[PDB]
Structures are given as structure tokens and as C-alpha cells.
Amino acid sequence: AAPAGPGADMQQRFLNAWRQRLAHGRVRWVAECQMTAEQFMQPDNANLA
Amino acid sequence: HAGVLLMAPQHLDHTIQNGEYFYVLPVHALFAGADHVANAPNFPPALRDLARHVPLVPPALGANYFSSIRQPVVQHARESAAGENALTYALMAGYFKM
Amino acid sequence: AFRDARGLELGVGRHAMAPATIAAVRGAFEDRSYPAVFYLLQAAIHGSEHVFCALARLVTQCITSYWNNTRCAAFVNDYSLVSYIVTYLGGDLPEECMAVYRDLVAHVEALAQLVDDFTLPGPELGGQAQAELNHLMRDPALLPPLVWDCDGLMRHAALDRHRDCRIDAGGHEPVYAAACNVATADFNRNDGRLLHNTQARAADAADDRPHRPADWTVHHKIYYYVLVPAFSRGRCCTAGVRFDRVYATLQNMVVPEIAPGEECPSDPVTDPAHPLHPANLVANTVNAMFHNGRVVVDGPAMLTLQVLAHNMAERTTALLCSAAPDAGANTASTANMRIFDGALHAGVLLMAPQHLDHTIQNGEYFYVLPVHALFAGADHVANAPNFPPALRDLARHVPLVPPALGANYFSSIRQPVVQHARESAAGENALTYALMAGYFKM
Amino acid sequence: AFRDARGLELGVGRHAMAPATIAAVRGAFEDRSYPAVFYLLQAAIHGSEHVFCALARLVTQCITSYWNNTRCAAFVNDYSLVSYIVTYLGGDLPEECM
Amino acid sequence: YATLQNMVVPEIAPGEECPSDPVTDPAHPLHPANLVANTVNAMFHNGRV
Amino acid sequence: YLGRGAPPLLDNAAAVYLRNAVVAGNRLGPAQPLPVFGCAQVPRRAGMD
Amino acid sequence: APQFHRPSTITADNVRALGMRGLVLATNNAQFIMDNSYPHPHGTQGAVREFLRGQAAALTDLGVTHANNTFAPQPMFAGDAAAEWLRPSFGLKRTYSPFVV
Amino acid sequence: APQFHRPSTITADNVRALGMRGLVLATNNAQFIMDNSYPHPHGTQGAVREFLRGQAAALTDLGVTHANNTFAPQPMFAGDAAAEWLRPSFGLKRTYSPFVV
Numbered sequence A: 001a002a003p004a005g006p007g008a009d010m011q012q013r014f015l016n017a018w019r020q021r022l023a024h025g026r027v028r029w030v031a032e033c034q035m036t037a038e039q040f041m042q043p044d045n046a047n048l049a
Numbered sequence B: 001h002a003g004v005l006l007m008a009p010q011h012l013d014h015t016i017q018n019g020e021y022f023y024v025l026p027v028h029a030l031f032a033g034a035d036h037v038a039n040a041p042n043f044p045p046a047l048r049d050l051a052r053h054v055p056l057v058p059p060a061l062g063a064n065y066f067s068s069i070r071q072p073v074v075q076h077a078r079e080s081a082a083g084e085n086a087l088t089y090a091l092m093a094g095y096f097k098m
Numbered sequence C: 001a002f003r004d005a006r007g008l009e010l011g012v013g014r015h016a017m018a019p020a021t022i023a024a025v026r027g028a029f030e031d032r033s034y035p036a037v038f039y040l041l042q043a044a045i046h047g048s049e050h051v052f053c054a055l056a057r058l059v060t061q062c063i064t065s066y067w068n069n070t071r072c073a074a075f076v077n078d079y080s081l082v083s084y085i086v087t088y089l090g091g092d093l094p095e096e097c098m099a100v101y102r103d104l105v106a107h108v109e110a111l112a113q114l115v116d117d118f119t120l121p122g123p124e125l126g127g128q129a130q131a132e133l134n135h136l137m138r139d140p141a142l143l144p145p146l147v148w149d150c151d152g153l154m155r156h157a158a159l160d161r162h163r164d165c166r167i168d169a170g171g172h173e174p175v176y177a178a179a180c181n182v183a184t185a186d187f188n189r190n191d192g193r194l195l196h197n198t199q200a201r202a203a204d205a206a207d208d209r210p211h212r213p214a215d216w217t218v219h220h221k222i223y224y225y226v227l228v229p230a231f232s233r234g235r236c237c238t239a240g241v242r243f244d245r246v247y248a249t250l251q252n253m254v255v256p257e258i259a260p261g262e263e264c265p266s267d268p269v270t271d272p273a274h275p276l277h278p279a280n281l282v283a284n285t286v287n288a289m290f291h292n293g294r295v296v297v298d299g300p301a302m303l304t305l306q307v308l309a310h311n312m313a314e315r316t317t318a319l320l321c322s323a324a325p326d327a328g329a330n331t332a333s334t335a336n337m338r339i340f341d342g343a344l345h346a347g348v349l350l351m352a353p354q355h356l357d358h359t360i361q362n363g364e365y366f367y368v369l370p371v372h373a374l375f376a377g378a379d380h381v382a383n384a385p386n387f388p389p390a391l392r393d394l395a396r397h398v399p400l401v402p403p404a405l406g407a408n409y410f411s412s413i414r415q416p417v418v419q420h421a422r423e424s425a426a427g428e429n430a431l432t433y434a435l436m437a438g439y440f441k442m
Numbered sequence D: 001a002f003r004d005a006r007g008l009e010l011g012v013g014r015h016a017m018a019p020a021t022i023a024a025v026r027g028a029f030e031d032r033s034y035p036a037v038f039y040l041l042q043a044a045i046h047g048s049e050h051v052f053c054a055l056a057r058l059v060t061q062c063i064t065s066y067w068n069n070t071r072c073a074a075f076v077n078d079y080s081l082v083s084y085i086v087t088y089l090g091g092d093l094p095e096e097c098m
Numbered sequence E: 001y002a003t004l005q006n007m008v009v010p011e012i013a014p015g016e017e018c019p020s021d022p023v024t025d026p027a028h029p030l031h032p033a034n035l036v037a038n039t040v041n042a043m044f045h046n047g048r049v
Numbered sequence F: 001y002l003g004r005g006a007p008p009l010l011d012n013a014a015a016v017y018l019r020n021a022v023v024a025g026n027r028l029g030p031a032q033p034l035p036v037f038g039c040a041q042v043p044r045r046a047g048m049d
Numbered sequence G, H: 001a002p003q004f005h006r007p008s009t010i011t012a013d014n015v016r017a018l019g020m021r022g023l024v025l026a027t028n029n030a031q032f033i034m035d036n037s038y039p040h041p042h043g044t045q046g047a048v049r050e051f052l053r054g055q056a057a058a059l060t061d062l063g064v065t066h067a068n069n070t071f072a073p074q075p076m077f078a079g080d081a082a083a084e085w086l087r088p089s090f091g092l093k094r095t096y097s098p099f100v101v
Helices: A011-022 B034-039 B046-054 B072-079 B084-092 C003-010 C019-027 C034-046 C049-069 C079-087 C095-111 C153-157 C217-233 C243-251 C286-293 C299-310 C415-422 C430-440 D004-008 D018-028 D037-045 D049-070 D077-085 E040-046 F014-021 G012-017 G020-026 G046-065 H013-015 H025-027 H044-065
Strands: C167-169 C174-175 C193-195 C236-243 C315-323 C343-345 C366-368
Touching: A011 B046, B034 B046, B072 B084, B084 D004, B084 D018, C003 C430, C019 C095, C019 C217, C019 C430, C034 C049, C034 C243, C034 C286, C049 C079, C049 C095, C049 C299, C079 C095, C079 C217, C095 C217, C095 C430, C095 D049, C153 C217, C153 C315, C217 C415, C217 C430, C243 C286, C243 C299, C243 G046, C286 C299, C299 G046, C343 F014, C415 C430, C430 G012, D037 E040, D049 D077, G012 H044, H013 H044
Parallel strands: C174 C193
Antiparallel strands: C167 C315, C236 C366, C315 C343
């Protein structure tokens, strides 16, 4: 995004606007936290493509 | 520019409110208190679950993919048990560019 | 021997609890001589912020005295206080005596971070967080065995009506009461009304909203269902507090009148003008109970006990509460079975069995409710007055938990978890992880 | 166990961060008793060379007390100060704390 | 800058000395009688410095 | 999940949740959602060895 | 002049008349024999409820004899302050030692 | 004497006419009710700049009444000296504690 508004409220804007966006579906790069190497190679994780 | 880092969380003060002096910003994913971000005033109640797994960094401060350190360097911090003096070197070896 | 391989495996080096901070804990739970002033104070503080910052000084005195006498950290039987002794009192306690109070809070928060290593991301199901379908400690369906608030009870009831949230409080549904001061006593009532007496200051009060952080309840469960049974080996039992006689023997005051040409006497022995002198002792007052208790507390600080006028507490209310199994586990075959786990609003946890002092009776202030099979003594439940002499043998063998507070096969923590606390020599630091692994759900 | 076994292989003997100096610095990041005065000074100094030689007597009286109460290092959350705490205060801080 | 500059610094008498001990010395800035609710000196004591 | 005849767990949010987190990518699990009548069928393999 | 061996005698104005220091010896000096001839109109358990009042009422009455020995209780918490629109509010847990020459 | 429940009242002189000893009490003793009838002409945050000047000005008058208690301030660094062409310049790192007997 573009930095906008004062520093104090820059986070509250984001949160309030993104409440749904974070809550729709899981986030990719964090979803891979627990992937073992061998799980990462299987057809299960679709990110291989 | 002219910011301050907050080492350890103290939210329990009813002797000190959270928004008195320092309003918390999570500049970069390496710096987001899972505690701190959760205890800010008006923190949405639903996100309390999700905010534990993931950091919350405002897209005005830059996003994961578009930063110069992607996610995992964070987790190599949390997870690695190698000990303090043995970590830091591993990090200085993490930042050799490709 | 299996589990302590499982548990000691999870000891990958997440967090450990320093050996000094262990022996100085067991050194608490096992003291046969432990000052009864500490039990009485908890009843006075009864969890509240406002009460604690008022009495904050008295605490600082009692510990360092007890820390320098027996060298065992006190106030361990309540996590609420242990959670404050870290945050509020920063530099008062010695360099050494703090570390014992840091590890407990730390080593708790270390266990709370197992569960989020072992859960995958995923959408919520029954209105419950995804981790709540994994681990028991993250379940709202439980309650801490001791609660000072109505706050937790709010969330549990709020669970999906699929999970059937009722309470029999002295036998009736939940009602939550605002605050309690001198004028409002009501120590005997069996009705549903439940105090909220724990509030930051006089300005902010409600029964329908909590004033506290989000994880507050979890860390409690992790403390009582893991740490205490790890250290205590199940030698401790819950006991209902009688608020009739607590404030009384607290508000008995021998504070000598100070002359302006003098100083403030600090000496409990030689100073005739310090309330702890054997001449100022009049049987069963506070300063006289310090004599039976061997604690140093100043006459002027004795005044701050005035704040009891500004907040009081009601009674110890037994609570059943029911739950149906999970959103994840609920099958048309399962739906009709329920889990019953009792709890106590405004109750306290005893540690060591002092029954042999004819100077301290058993049933004066604290009366013994063996809430949960994890909490039963051999020498506590047996030494209560009017214990049937026939059961004295069998009482060694089994927990005597009365069915009004819930039985085994319906509970959510069965017997075989208990003996894993007694029968495992793994140590204090390798049980805590071994237990946390025990509490994942099938 | 890779990212370390390499970094640790860079641990050939370059520098050892002393274990006692490790025990302290954690205690700072782990203090929930960490006094807010220490934060305020940082906002005051704001990195200034001058302002620090002005308050140079305060810091010492602030540190040595803290070091004596919890036996931990303080002002750890800014590197500038830690660079000032060296190049200026030689003999003031205790033999142990330097 | 506000609550660094809200100051109780008591004046020192000409013959009296400079207090090093915060408890029994009335002229110390952090002295409890000099501590006023939520002030600079009450701040140093609130943080125990 | 090839098979059939077990009572689904009660929350259609969860009963669909599990299956999708299991049947997905499995070398075996049904490809097309279960044909109601004859049998489930295994995904065809590209090549065998 | 209250009598503790007659339960109907105990009131707040009778217990307030005899101060805290008198209350100290008033508990021991009584007689072991109790009189049930005249029960308590509100019930006998009202005397234990009445017992906490007199002491709690004398607590803040005890610090009045110490009024020259103590300070004024400050806010121990934030959110309690005169004006928040210039400086924020701390709160003061009193670990200091009220005494005055 | 400025009244603290009207923002438009506080000025430079009205606060400067008050000393450091009376600065701490007036802030805790104010009224909890605010008037919306007559606000400050330059706004609320324009007066925020105005009060912080008084504290520095109060620090001065504090350290002016405490000026007789301190010593002559030296430069804390080199580069500030009258004669650099005979000897160079230090500056005094101030670890000392100015006090006057």
C-alpha cells in the first residue's frame, strides 16, 4: 500500500479494512511453516506448480 | 525515522495504558510482537486466533514478497535451538545474496 | 515409561526451568511450616487489581522475609498473584528471588507454544479456533478449577448451544453479580449470582465484559492442569474459603499510636512500639497471628488493609457445567454423551497438610472441597473433622471427590492421567512437557 | 539443521559471545519489570552525541542500580547507546557490567 | 518531554547537603513526600530508578 | 472415503473440511465426487513401473 | 457498654463506641457462657455479619489516629487522573513508607 | 491564574507566572468538566505546543532557582574553545554532580 495518514492510526486503518481479507482464506507463505521437506514434494501441496 | 523498539510486552498495566506514550507499529515482520499486536486497543476479536500464527505488518510498511527478507528467516529465528552464539553466525550466513 | 520418552522428546530445548527455581518451588509446596498469613492475604486480595496495588507493599515485605528465612518462594499456590508479582513488583524482590517468579510465567508460556507448533492452519469449525479442536488446554469447554471472575464463565456459556453450556451454581443457572464491598456480604447463598470483584479501579465495572488480555484463562489452565500436579504430586486439595472470618482476623488491628518525637519502629522483637512485639500480641489478631506465623509486617503498612472497606468478596460457589463433544468429534452416535467438569468461583488451593497444631484447627477458615481427582490429599481429606473411620484405609487408595462436583467416567480428565503424575520419576521439568502431550484430543 | 550446521561451521573460532553476557541480555528482553524510564531517556537522547554527554551522569546512576537490582543489562534496545555506553563510560559502570 | 519536565525538584538549603538516599531524605527528587501522583519523580520511583 | 455407509460427523462445515484435507492429492482418494450408485473410482495413473 | 454474651446487644454504634484498641481486648475478656434467652431479631448469624463492619469501619478510622503518619492514596492505576489531555496518567502502587515527623 | 477547564485560557505568561513548586499541584486539582463554548483560537494542538514550552521555561526557573546549586557549564565536547592554536580542546563529559556548600 501507500503510506497514508498519521503514524498512530496507520495500523488501525489496515486492521479495520483487512479484517475480512485476513479472514477469508489462509495465507500462503505462512501456511508452509510446518511443511517437512518430504511433505513439500508430494502432490498434496498445490504450490509445487 | 526516529522510532523506538519495545523489547518485552507489558499489557497488564492499568497503571500504564497502551496508547499513552508509544503507539505500536510493526515495521517489518521480524519485528511484530505476537503479544503486542494482539493487545492493542480495538484489536478485532476474530483476528486474535490468526494473529498468533502470522505477523501483522501494514502494507504501507511493505509486504512479505516485496521485502528483502521473506518469511522463513523469521522462523529460522524462532525454531533453531542452536543457542545464541551459534545462531547469529547462521544468520550472517543467511544473508549472502543470490 | 512410554510417555516420558514422548514428553522428554518434546524437551527439544524449547524452554527449561532452572534447577534452583525448582527446589525453591518444591520448597514451598512441601513446607509443613508455611505461614497462614499467606493464605489469608489471598482471600483478601481475591485476585483484584485495585486490591493488589493497594496492598502491594505488604506483599513485598512478606516474601523477602520468607525468602530469607526458609529460602522458598511463596504465593505459588495462585497463578494470578504469580502473574502480578512479575509485572508490578519489579525491583523490590532480590536479584535471586525474582528468577523463581520469572520462570513459572516463562515456563508456562513455553507450554502454550507447543500447540501452535502441532496444528495446521484451517478455517474455524464450531465457532471454535482450529487449535481448540486440537488441544484440550485451548478448549473453552473447560474452566480453570479456580476462578475469581465471571469472565471465563461468559465465554464457555457462549459456546455453541450444540455444546450445552449450563451451570448448576449451588444447583442453578449462571447469574453474574457486579461488585462486592462492605455493605454487600451474602456469604452463604446458593443462588446463581456470581461476583465480579476484580477490577482495576473504582471507575470501570461490568458483569458482561472482561477487563483483561485474551490468553489470560489459558495460562491458568496450563498452570493448574500441568505445573501444580507436576510439582505437588497430587498432595494438595482445593478448599472453600469462608469470608466470614477472614476479614475479621484481618481487621483485628493492633497498630500502636505513634508519638511525633519518635521514629517508625521497624523491629518485631526489641521495639515495644512495633505491632509484632510479644507485648502487643493479643491472641488471634493480625499482628498476633504474625507471631504464630513468623512474618514481619509494619504497623503503618497494617493500615493499608483499610482498602478492604473498598472491596469485599462473597463466598465459594460450586459449579457444575456441561459440554457436548467437539464440532469435530460430534457424530450422530456421539451426540448424546456429555462431559461434566466442576469448578469453583472464588476458591483457594491448599498445599501442605497441617492438621496436628491444636493452635490451628482444620475447619476454622478454609473448608475442603475436593474439586477434581487431580486435587485430593491423602492427609488432607482424611484429616478433616468427621471423617468416617471406616474409609480411612480406602481413602488412601482413591480420590474422594464428591459426585456433585463431577465423577470420573464423565469427566474430561480421567484417572490414569493422575497416576502419571505420581508414578513418573522423569522430574519436574520433563513431566510438564509429558503432560502437555497427554492433553491433545482424540 | 542445515542452516545451523553451516553457520556453526562458520563458528570456527571467530568470536565467542560470552555465556555470562548471554544470560544478561536475555533478561533484558525477558523483563516484564523492565522500567519505562529507560524508554523515556531513549526518546530524549534520540541518538544525539551531545545530549548523551549531557545526561551521561544519569545513565550511570540509572544502570548501576538496575544492574544491582535484577543483575541484567539495560538500554539493550538501541545499538547507538550501546556504542555510547562503551566509548564514553569506562570506569563508572562496575567491573562486571562493562 | 512532557512527563520528563513535570518536575518536583525541591530547593536545597544553604547548609544542607545533597541527598543520595531516596527514602529518609526530604530533599531528594524521588522522595515519597516529593513524589506527587504520576509525575517525573513519581515516574522514576514508579520504575524504581 | 472411497467407501460409504458411515454416519457423517454432524457439522457440514467440518465433515466437508476433513474430506477435502484428506482426499486431496491422495494417490487413491476419489477424483470426481462419489458417484451415488456403483463405486468410487481411483484416479488413473499416467504411467506405471 | 455492649455485652457480647447477649447476642441482641451487638450493634454498630455500640461497637464503634469502643475503639479498635479496646476491640483488641474486648474479644478475650468475655465470659464462656452464652445466653439464648433473647435471640437476634434479624437472626443470630447477623452478629458475624455485624462483626466485619465494626473492624472495617475502624480501619479507615484507625488511620485517622495515624493521619499525621500517612500520605494521601494516589491513583494506583491509569485512567484515574484529573486531566488527561496534556500528560498521560501513570498509577502509583504505594511501596513507599508513609511516615511524617 | 489560568483555569484549566477552558483551553483558550492557558497562555505563555499565565503559566510562566507560576513556579515549578506550584506546577505539579494545579494539574491534579483541575475540574473534570470541559467547556465547548469558548475553545482556543489556534486549536487544541496549537496549545499543546504552548504547554511544553512552559515546562522547559519551568525547567529553567527550576534550574534558575537551582542555578546557585550548580557550576559553570563547560562544553561537553571538543571544537568549542577560545584558543585552539596553542593547546587543543577537550570537552567535559559530565559525570560529576554539581552541588554548592
